[PDB]
Design a binder for these strands. Sequence first.
DNA 1: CACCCGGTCACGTGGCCTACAC
DNA 2: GTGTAGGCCACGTGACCGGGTG
Lengths: 92, 96
Amino acid sequence: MATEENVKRRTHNVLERQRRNELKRSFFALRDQIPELENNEKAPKVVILKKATAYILSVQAETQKLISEIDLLRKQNEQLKHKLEQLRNSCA
Amino acid sequence: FQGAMATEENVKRRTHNVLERQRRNELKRSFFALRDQIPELENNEKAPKVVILKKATAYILSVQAETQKLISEIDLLRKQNEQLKHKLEQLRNSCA
DNA sequence: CACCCGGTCACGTGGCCTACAC
DNA sequence: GTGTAGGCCACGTGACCGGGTG
C-alpha cells in the first residue's frame, strides 16, 4: 500500500528523467545544425534557441535574395535569347 | 551561531529560486520565438518543447537543402548566360 | 460515469563551475 | 589561498490534460 506509492513515485521519476534526456538529445541535435554553434561547443540551451531563431531568419533573407537573383538571371537570359533571335532574322 | 546558519541557507535558497524563475521565463520566451519561425509550428501556441526542437532541426535541414539547390540553379543560369553572351559576341564580328 | 496513463509542464533545490572578491 | 556571487543544469516532485479502458 505505502510501498505502492513509492513504486508509482519512483517510476514517475525515472519516466521524467528519460523524457528529460530525450529533450537534451534534441537540444544537442539542433545545436549541431547551427554553423555558429560549431561541431561541439558547450552552449547554454537559451543560446541554442536564440541563435537558431536568428539563423533561420538569416537563411530566409538569403533565400529571398537568391530567388531575386535567379529571376534576374532569367530576365537577362530570355532577353539574350530574344536578342540572338533577332540576329538571325536580320542577317541575310 | 545556532540557526543563523539555516537563516543564511534560506536566503541563498530564495535568491537562487527567484533567479531560476527569471532564467526559466526567458527560456520560455526563447522557445516561443523559435516556434513562431517554424511554418509547420506557427499559430499553434500549445506546442511541446521537444517538438519545437525536432522540427526546428528538421526545418533547418530542409531550408539548407533548398538553399543548395537555389545556388546550383544560379550557377546553371549564369553558365548559360555567359555562353549566350559569347556566341552573340563573335556573331557580331562575323556579320558585317 | 470515474480511473488511470502517457505526455507535458513549472517549480524548488543542490551540485557544479567560472570568475571575481577578500 | 578561501572564499563567494552567477549562471547552467538535471534532479525529484506535484499538477495538468488527454484518450482510452475498466
